[PDB]
Ligand binder design. Structure first.
Ligand SMILES: Nc1ccn([C@@H]2O[C@H](COP(=O)(O)OP(=O)(O)OP(=O)(O)O)[C@@H](O)[C@H]2O)c(=O)n1
Ligand SMILES: [Mg+2]
Lengths: 746, 486, 733
RNA sequence: GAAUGCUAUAAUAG
RNA sequence: UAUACCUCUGCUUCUGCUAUU
RNA sequence: AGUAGUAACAAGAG
């Protein structure tokens, strides 16, 4: 026979040109299982493993085991070194400051003038943040609310002023409180009369009880970071640990990152924060110059680079120095403000996830061991790998079930600032006036170093030097992953350069599917993804037209909305088929109503509802676009309409508000557990806001501003509304008296 | 300070660079060639090249899944009526009796005149779906007291050797059939010449795949994984007989329903996304499991009569396997259609590239060849150690297949190998481009690739194919050794 | 009378002591925090969760209302909705079948105003509907990555100004402090308010719909000769990498966008015409068949009153009254007397950095205009001399002075640059320093005025000077005066110079702007060989492609006639992307290396193909008779636009193993069109003119000689050459 | 003959 | 104990940072 | 059993 070999394409077409075929993104991503404690412990061990030769001491604040590698002994080998030398970090930054004059104070100015304008609500846009009041992750908006409600009880109203600064002041103040008091709910039974045999009904009501914790127990929770495992970690074998931070420390990180962003935006070699086309442009322009600047006869070489243990090796005390050196001309308060975030990170505590599951196969019994109770059982009862992990964890472990972690940044907390410290290495360019000159691009750990020298033997002298320079900043280049070749092709953040960044269609393929927002949206998204891929990711018109089909299939199967003329059996299909028969203008019907797909390459960017509107039946569009339909939930008649409606966001996809713009029922797992009580807390805030929005219609659109009471605002508006409703003649005397009387009671 | 520190830093700290030479690129994953390791087994969810669909020509308009599965067996009653278990192969930890009883319960239940495809929770179906096999949760208080309760050693993927059936799967899935599976829906009428070029260009690309084995298999995988997910949510606490169905259209344009076998879905109280639902597959196949015995350790096979394949009476077997899937894999199954795009795009890129050179639409040229240009060929594979050239269509199909296998054998092992090997693929391309590439720790770079190669068939075969291709490249390089050498 | 209901509900709400304390404690600011408060963890796998949840009985949640109650519980044995109320909506839950039911047998709502509400989109459709599609072309397209407007706007404003206008339209009461903006869009506010008046659509939607057509959505995209939003919206259909599509949108197209593109056309015509003998011939040839979207260049130049030198040159070339009318964004001038000499110089600015700017020499007079305000300006090299103006609008007078101050390029204007001024873009792209300095001093004026200096006002008849505040003052800005008081037949040389009837020249093709830029509207050339106005990489590829095509003949004709086939229309175009100051030198080199291969038996087809195009520009040898020697041949555009003599390059490299030539990424097979001896035949010979290989690297000769050291050798002298990493060669003269 | 700087519930990247 | 062949649940069994915005 | 793979599910809860 004849045996096919798919790699034999690479004979005809070069790797870069057909890189798409090396990304298996029709296949399933890796997901985690059970506990992240193992994966967390690994980071905790490794961080200290690269710092162990440094200065170890006991924190007389937290009582924790702290290790300080900075200004430590220089490495004897190529094992990851965290032993960065302040002098060399500063010297690097001085050169950067010389190369980019005024940039530090120019950024500091912007970053400072931002903070002054920055409100507290800024914190309510960070997914799941760690809440110290309950010692679990929670929505950013809630995690804040809990902290604000808690703070008020300790006489901390800085939040109420509205600016981020005075709220931040309350956080660093909260540390000096001897005890910290916070609400935590308790159930209470209560007889309620009901049409019942016994003539009543018992129901459990929530009651906010004031819990207290000590100065230390609070500090530790403030310095705490909760840990998970990273799920859907593409192109990797074994999983890795990720960290979420406290509402206390999230404040100060924003400003230190914002500072580094301002610096990065105005750097030649910074891959962040620029992205996609903006990035490709900048890197294409960068390569073009550094290529052509090469000495004639001399060799230009590109080191496709990657740093190992980026998080574990980088030190907070270095990040502290960076802010202090960057804000040199900034006023005393802002110098200090910036200094907090690193100082928190240099005393931070890593939470150890869920724990470890122990089982008996003979008995068929399993049990989770909480992180506090890790050293409850003899370590022989744990497996080999976990035994060593726990043994190595031992000296950094805390009785409450956490790990002291003075060294290390941890996953992605300071990307912008790390990028700056990276660029700072590229800022040197030469060591000892040798016959080479290096200059590259940096995007977090990911870096591409260009070296223009007289011969490749000399280039290596330059790379070897750069390596040694990075070692002094706590930057370890991966000798395994990183490689080098003559300039003309390289790889950077999975962008593959071959005399010009190539097209890699495969990477953004998963985004072609049904997004999972709803029918009306996922159509728009689905077409916009095709439209955008046709432009940016070089998808030809045939593949593009096929993509439409393949989407429409997925859509029709997902939302069970096949052609009304089709004979695909189904519950929705029964009514769809009745609509197909009842309707005259069938070409006007949307796909979701078993209508025909009329999308092509040209009209991808027009909403389906707008495309077909002209050829709909009046009754059908009258139904589909009913102003007060029940699926969307508009405005009202004023009975008592107060649902737990979330703020109407401004998504990039273009879709019309029709019956297919529905919302799914909320996961009710919460009904079984004691968390139930939170629904009442929600539906309270909901009632308050919803009514407020009836007083101020602008609140829905633009953020309302005021440090006064909501009730105060609502009252006056309603008073004016009532007075002018009487004076105008919209309201009668009987009603106005009732209005002024009812408002009087407030 | 940097000078002062670099001066006093140990010379032992360096990148230790070396210029890459072809001979330094040894074959990856040498264990795959060790015969003493076990043959990597067929571990897919459904059968692929070994599949066998019973042809049931429909009126053209659809019916209920029970109804088509019934009427399909009603035609092939000789098989459906076969009540005598002629067992051929047994899975080490399986029950012939229970499995056969289950098969017969499926056949009977799907054959009966009732509405429901529900299965009575019998002692056999309970063993098959793995009833109450989950461990009981207990208090850490009690847990700690018990010394016999311990943290289990992680189960690891064991090492396996190269297996022919993987190569054979590629080969057969890649090849042309008479049958079109794909269900690609309607489009808007074309106006812009771009759309007219796109549509005409589709006719070549879409068909070339639609008329290939991989396509049918993909569509089967999708349409199954749909009904399975639909059942999983709807009928949570119910054992259900899902028929492995798939619609096919022949050259003459006749709609045939293809029943490949019956599957049973265990209780699917799927809370988490990873949370498993045991699915027991009974699949029709002409393939004799005695032939490639090391392929079917996971399966239990019953001879259930014969069929006329043409002039030949091929004996029909029944491949019975206790399998499992989860919410994710089931969803990604329904999103397997996008295999068309990854493959179609990559070749449309070449069509469009070649179109810029010649200055017209090179679609018709690349496949067949026009008056100006002869057809486009690609180095396709080997034949007793000698390179062979294949058609543009073949080259396309080979990728589309590869992309299906990227799903079918898609896991952590593949992700890793694919990503880490890409790094070496480039280091090769540099040697090919003659951009004198350098490496710092080649061994460490290799180990990262070689640790991913365990018990994934597509990984193990991709290592073999990579090693084979590398060898053929390494030869081609010689031509350049003596160039501008005087 | 909705007011009463709200007050009555407030009394109900305030009975919940929990709600009371929330309302009493939570500040209007903190509303933003508690609004977003919820239990719901963010759905990380919605694609899955949807696909799954669609298979459940009741996935959707109705809003508790009389409308929700119009949906029946079941329809023909289909459970449409349940009794169980959702946690969120506190209303009945339902199956997707409910929607399908409502859309079929539901109540027929009033869809009045819909079209006016969603006009933004209906126009988006109307443009595609009333469009015209041209031909698809297959060939190289150099896509440039640039920041463009995604969606056509009704009127462009900053987000802040835009939001404030929307407030004035939709939410009058909760507007806050009235801004200037309010009056500036008074027409648009009333117009929109009168259109959206009768509508039942939720105000929050009308907000985002206005926001969509007032706030600018401006993002980076790969574009090619199409910047206009009404083109950008269709960018996916406009072009690929290797194909182009002509598409004329509908509705209207702006006279400004018609103008700014019309310039690029002329500049591109001239740029290419300069290379041929009788440039006027080709200039006319192309211009007559140059179409701007649907409008002929000649018609456009006639219709539009404005544009740059190039526009006037082409106008003359076609035979149209040349308008020496000029623009500088807001400022618009017309020359009375003077001749401008644009010299690129390194200007120090007030903040303390060095920016490269094109400074204009000579004393010139212009008729400056800004809105309803007019004036006469007089300037010399980096110094404003005298500015006469009218007393029109206070801000129009204020702007004209700032525009004239900047336009003059006075060393005082550069001194008043205090703060951050970006000449370089976030993506390391060049922004026009004069057009950014213009844009900066329109925002910060008080700096410029104080950093300029004042003097005594004029004491003439109708001359009375104005101070900082633009009032008839005693102290006026140094060389500013306010007054009460507000062509000629040309011919064009074949070499493209506009001569007066006397003899003095007013313009020449040497005076047009060198900067190529993305035309706003689609530029089409209705003559065959339109590629000639293309980009560096396009021309480079299309040329070598045409060389490969006719290699059969061109190579043979070379072995018979020496210079017969050096003059080809393809190689002419190709010259227009060669730096004119190296064009001749490159030809001088290439022809010698070619002739060296033909005569001394040592051929190399890949090299022949590479160099042949350069051999068009009349040769330019050194003074000692021998040609100039080169390692790389730099072309117009980015630092990657160069051809390597010895090695391959981002534009051109040959793979002998595959016999595959690679041009701008596109791969072509030289199989069949290759001699048998070539393979073993070294390149060393066809690398330097009058230089051939003798043996291999001789350590006695020492290191490898540079271009200079090579050029400075006497015939029959050995030397060490490096072709590419690890190919040392011993070459002799 | 230039600009206009942003800031999703998706996906990708690190 | 019991109701319980009952009832409730199917991301909430800790999913982070920074870009593309 | 099986899925799966460095740790889980093979229903969980009143
Ligand atoms: N999901 C991710 C991936 C990456 N990162 C950030 O990007 C850095 C680089 O990640 P990667 O290169 O994948 O790993 P390394 O940190 O270099 O680790 P290793 O030593 O294993 O290569 C991380 O340290 C972290 O700062 C992140 O925050 N979240
Ligand atoms: Mg790394």
């Amino acid at each position: 026979g004849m045996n096919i070999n798919p790699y034999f394409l690479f004979i005809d077409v070069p790797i870069q040109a057909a890189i798409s075929t090396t990304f298996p993104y029709t296949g399933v991503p890796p997901y985690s299982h059970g506990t992240g404690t193992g994966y967390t412990i690994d980071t905790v061990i490794r961080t200290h493993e690269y710092s162990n030769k440094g200065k170890q001491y006991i924190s007389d604040v937290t009582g924790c085991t702290m290790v300080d590698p900075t200004n430590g002994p220089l490495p004897e080998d190529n094992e990851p070194s965290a032993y960065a030398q302040l002098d060399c970090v500063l010297e690097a930054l001085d050169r950067m400051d010389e190369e980019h004059p005024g940039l530090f104070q120019a950024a500091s100015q912007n970053a400072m003038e931002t903070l002054m304008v920055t409100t507290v609500d800024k914190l309510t846009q960070g997914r799941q943040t760690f809440d110290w009041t309950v010692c679990r992750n929670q929505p950013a908006a809630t995690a804040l609310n809990t902290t604000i409600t808690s703070f008020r009880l300790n006489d901390l109203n800085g939040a109420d002023k509205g600016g981020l600064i005075p709220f931040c002041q309350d956080i660093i103040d909260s540390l000096d409180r001897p005890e910290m008091t916070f609400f935590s709910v308790k159930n209470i039974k209560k007889k309620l009369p009901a049409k019942n045999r016994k003539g009543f009904l018992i129901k459990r009501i929530p009651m906010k009880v004031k819990d207290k914790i000590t100065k230390v127990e609070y500090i530790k929770r403030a310095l705490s970071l909760n840990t998970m495992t990273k799920d859907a970690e593409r192109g990797k074998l074994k999983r890795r640990a990720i960290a979420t931070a406290g509402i206390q420390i999230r404040g100060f990180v924003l400003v230190v990152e914002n500072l580094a962003k301002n610096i990065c935006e105005n750097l030649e070699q910074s891959g962040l924060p620029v992205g996609g086309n903006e990035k490709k442009a900048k890197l294409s322009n960068a390569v073009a110059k550094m290529l052509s600047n090469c000495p004639p006869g001399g060799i230009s070489m590109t080191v496709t680079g990657d740093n190992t243990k980026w998080n574990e090796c980088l030190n907070p005390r270095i990040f502290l120095a960076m802010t202090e050196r960057i804000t040199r001309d900034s006023p005393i308060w802002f110098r200090d403000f910036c200094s907090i975030a690193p100082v928190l990170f240099s005393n931070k505590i890593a939470r150890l996830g869920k724990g470890f599951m122990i089982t008996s196969k003979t008995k068929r019994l399993k049990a989770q061991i909480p992180c506090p109770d890790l050293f409850s059982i003899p370590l022989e009862r744990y497996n080999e790998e976990t035994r060593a992990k726990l043994k190595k964890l031992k000296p950094f472990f805390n009785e409450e079930g956490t790990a002291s972690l003075s060294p290390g940044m941890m996953m992605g907390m300071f990307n912008m600032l790390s990028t700056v410290l990276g660029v700072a290495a590229l800022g040197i360019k030469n060591i000892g006036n040798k016959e080479y000159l290096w200059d590259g691009l940096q995007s977090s750990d990911d870096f591409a170093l260009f070296v223009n020298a007289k011969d490749e033997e000399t280039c290596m002298e330059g790379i070897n030097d750069f390596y040694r320079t990075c070692k002094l900043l706590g930057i370890n280049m991966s000798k395994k992953k990183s490689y080098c070749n003559e300039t003309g092709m390289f790889e950077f953040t999975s962008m593959f350069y071959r005399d010009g960044f190539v097209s890699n269609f495969a990477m953004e393929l998963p985004s072609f599917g049904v997004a999972g927002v709803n029918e009306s949206a996922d159509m728009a998204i689905g077409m916009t993804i095709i439209k955008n891929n046709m432009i940016n990711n070089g998808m030809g018109p045939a593949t593009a037209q096929t993509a439409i089909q393949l989407f429409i299939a997925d859509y029709r199967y997902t939302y069970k909305c096949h052609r009304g003329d089709s004979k695909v059996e189904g519950k929705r299909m029964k009514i769809i088929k009745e609509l197909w028969e009842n309707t005259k203008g069938r070409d006007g019907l949307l796909v979701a109503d078993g209508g025909p797909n009329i999308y092509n390459l040209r009209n991808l960017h027009i909403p389906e509802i707008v495309l077909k509107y002209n050829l709909m039946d009046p009754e059908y569009k009258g139904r589909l676009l009913h102003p007060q339909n029940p699926f969307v939930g508009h405005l009202s008649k004023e009975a008592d309409i107060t649902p737990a409606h979330g703020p109407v966001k401004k998504m990039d996809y273009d879709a019309v508000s029709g019956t297919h713009s529905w919302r799914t029922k909320r996961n009710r797992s919460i009904l079984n557990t004691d968390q139930r009580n939170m629904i009442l807390e929600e539906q309270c805030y909901a009632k308050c806001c919803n009514l407020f929005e009836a007083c101020f219609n602008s609140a829905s659109y633009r953020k309302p501003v005021g440090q006064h009471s909501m009730l105060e605002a609502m009252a006056h508006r309603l008073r004016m509304d009532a007075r002018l409703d009487y004076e105008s003649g919209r309201m009668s005397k009987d009603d106005f008296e009732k209005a002024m009387a009812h408002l009087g009671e407030i | 300070a940097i000078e002062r520190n670099l001066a006093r830093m140990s010379p032992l700290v360096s990148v230790t660079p070396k210029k890459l030479t072809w001979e330094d690129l040894r074959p990856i994953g040498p264990h795959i060639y060790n015969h003493e390791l076990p043959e990597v087994p067929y571990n897919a969810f459904l059968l692929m090249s070994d599949e066998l669909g019973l042809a049931n020509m429909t009126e053209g308009k659809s019916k209920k899944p029970k109804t088509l599965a019934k009427e399909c067996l009603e035609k092939y009653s000789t098989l459906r009526d076969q009540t005598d278990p002629i067992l051929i192969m047994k899975s080490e930890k399986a029950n012939e009796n229970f499995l056969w009883k289950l098969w017969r319960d499926c056949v009977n239940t799907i054959s009966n005149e009732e509405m429901s495809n529900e299965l009575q929770k019998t002692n056999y179906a309970k063993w098959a779906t793995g009833d109450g096999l989950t461990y009981q949760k207990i208090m850490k208080e009690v847990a700690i007291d018990d010394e016999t309760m311990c943290q289990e050693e992680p189960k690891i993927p064991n090492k396996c050797r190269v297996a022919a059936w993987v190569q054979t799967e590629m080969n057969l899935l890649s090849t042309l059939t008479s049958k079109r599976a794909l269900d690609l829906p309607e489009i808007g009428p074309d106006v812009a010449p771009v759309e007219h070029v796109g549509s005409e260009r589709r006719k070549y690309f879409v068909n070339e795949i639609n008329y290939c084995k991989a396509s049918t298999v993909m569509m089967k995988y999708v349409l199954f994984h749909t009904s399975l997910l639909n059942e999983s949510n709807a009928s949570m606490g119910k054992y259900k007989v899902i028929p492995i169905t798939n619609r096919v259209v022949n050259e003459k344009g006749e709609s045939f329903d293809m029943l490949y076998g019956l599957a049973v879905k265990g209780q699917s109280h799927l809370r988490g996304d990873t949370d498993v639902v045991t699915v027991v597959t009974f699949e029709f196949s002409s393939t004799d499991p005695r032939v490639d015995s090391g392929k079917w350790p996971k399966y239990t096979v019953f001879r259930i009569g014969s069929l006329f394949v043409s002039g030949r009476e091929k004996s029909v077997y029944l491949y019975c396997r206790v399998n499992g899937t989860n919410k994710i894999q089931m969803k990604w199954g329904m999103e397997a259609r996008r295999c068309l795009l990854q493959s179609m795009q990559q070749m449309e890129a070449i069509v469009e590239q070649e179109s810029s050179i010649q200055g017209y639409d090179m679609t018709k040229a690349c496949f067949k060849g026009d008056r100006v240009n002869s057809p486009k060929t690609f180095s396709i594979g080997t034949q007793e150690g000698k390179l062979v050239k294949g058609s543009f269509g073949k080259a396309l199909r080979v990728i589309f297949t590869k992309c299906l296998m990227h799903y079918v054998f898609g896991n952590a092992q593949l992700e890793g190998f694919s990503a880490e090997s890409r790094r070496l693929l480039l280091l090769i391309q540099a040697l090919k481009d003659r951009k004198g590439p350098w490496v710092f720790d080649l061994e460490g770079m290799y180990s990262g690739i070689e640790e991913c190669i365990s018990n994934n068939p597509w990984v193990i075969q991709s290592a073999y194919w990579f090693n084979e291709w590398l060898g053929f490249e390494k030869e081609g390089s010689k031509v350049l050794e003596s160039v501008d050498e005087i | 009378g909705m007011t009463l209901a709200k007050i009555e509900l407030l009394k109900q709400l305030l009975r919940d002591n929990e709600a009371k304390t929330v309302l009493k404690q939570t500040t209007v600011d903190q509303y933003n925090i508690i609004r977003k408060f919820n239990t719901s963890r963010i759905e990380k796998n919605p694609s899955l969760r949807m696909k799954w949840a669609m298979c459940s009985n009741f996935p959707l949640a109705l809003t508790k209302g009389d409308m929700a109650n119009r949906i029946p519980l079941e329809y023909k044995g289909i459970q449409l909705k349940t009794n169980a109320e959702d946690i969120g909506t506190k209303g009945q839950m339902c199956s997707i079948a409910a929607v399908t039911w409502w859309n079929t047998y539901g109540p027929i709502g009033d869809t009045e105003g819909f079209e006016r509400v969603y006009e933004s989109f209906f126009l988006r459709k109307m443009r595609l509907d009333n469009a015209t599609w041209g031909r698809i072309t297959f060939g190289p397209v150099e896509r440039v990555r640039k920041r463009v407007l995604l969606n056509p706007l009704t009127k462009e404003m900053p987000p802040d100004e835009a939001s404030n206008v929307i407030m004035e339209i939709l939410f009058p009461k909760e507007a806050g402090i009235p801004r200037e903006s309010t009056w500036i869009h008074r027409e648009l506010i009333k117009e929109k308010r009168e259109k959206l008046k009768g509508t039942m659509i939720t105000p929050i939607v009308l907000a985002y719909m206005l926001e969509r057509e007032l706030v600018a959505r401006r993002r980076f995209l790969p574009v090619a000769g199409a910047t206009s939003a009404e083109f950008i919206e269709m960018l996916h259909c406009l072009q690929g990498e290797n194909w182009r599509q002509i598409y004329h949108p509908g509705g209207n197209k702006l006279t400004e966008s018609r103008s700014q593109s019309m310039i690029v056309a002329c500049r591109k015509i001239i740029r290419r015409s300069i290379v041929a003998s009788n440039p006027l011939e080709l200039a006319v040839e192309i211009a007559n068949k140059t179409v701007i979207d649907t409008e002929p260049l000649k018609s456009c130049l006639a219709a539009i009153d404005g544009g740059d030198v190039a526009c006037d040159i082409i106008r003359a070339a076609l035979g149209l009254k040349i308008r020496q009318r000029q623009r500088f964004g807001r400022l618009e001038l017309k020359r009375i007397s003077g001749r401008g000499f644009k010299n690129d110089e390194e200007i120090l600015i007030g903040n303390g950095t060095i920016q490269k700017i094109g400074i204009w020499d000579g004393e010139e007079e212009f008729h400056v205009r800004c809105g309803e305000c007019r004036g006469i300006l007089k300037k010399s090299k980096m110094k404003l001399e005298k500015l006469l103006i009218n007393s029109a609008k206070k801000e129009d007078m204020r702007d004209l002075i700032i525009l004239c101050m900047v336009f003059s390029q006075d060393t005082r204007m550069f001194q008043g640059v205090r703060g951050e001024i970006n000449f370089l873009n976030r993506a390391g792209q060049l922004l026009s320093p004069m057009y950014q300095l213009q844009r900066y001093f329109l925002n910060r004026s008080n700096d410029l005025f104080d950093q300029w200096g004042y003097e005594e006002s004029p004491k003439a008849s109708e001359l009375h000077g104005i101070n900082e505040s633009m009032n008839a003052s005693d102290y006026t800005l140094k060389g500013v005066v306010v007054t009460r008081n507000v062509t000629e037949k040309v011919s064009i040389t074949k070499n493209l110079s506009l001569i007066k009837r006397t003899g003095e020249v007013i313009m020449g093709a040497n005076d047009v702007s060198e900067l190529e830029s993305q035309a706003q509207l689609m530029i089409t050339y209705d003559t065959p060989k339109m590629w000639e106005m293309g980009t560096t990489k396009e021309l480079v590829q299309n040329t070598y492609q045409w060389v490969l095509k006719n290699l059969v003949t061109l190579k043979a004709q070379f072995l018979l006639g020496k210079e017969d086939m050096f003059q080809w229309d393809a190689f002419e175009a190709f010259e227009s992307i060669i730096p004119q100051k190296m064009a001749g030198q490159y030809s001088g080199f290439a022809r010698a290396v070619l002739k060296q291969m033909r005569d001394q038996e040592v051929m190399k087809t890949d090299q022949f193909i590479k160099l042949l195009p350069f051999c068009f520009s009349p040769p330019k040898l050194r003074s000692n008779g021998e040609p100039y020697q080169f390692l790389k041949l730099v072309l117009k555009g980015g630092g990657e636009n160069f051809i390597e003599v010895r090695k391959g390059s981002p534009l051109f490299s040959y793979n002998p193993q595959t016999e595959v030539l690679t041009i701008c990424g596109r791969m072509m097979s030289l199989k069949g069109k290759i001699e048998d001896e070539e393979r073993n035949r070294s390149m060393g010979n066809a690398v330097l003119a009058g230089f051939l290989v003798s043996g291999k690297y001789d350590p006695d000769l020492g290191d490898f000689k540079t271009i200079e050291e090579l050029e400075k050798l006497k015939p029959g002298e050995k030397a060490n050459i490096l072709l590419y990493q690890g190919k040392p060669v011993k070459v002799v003269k």
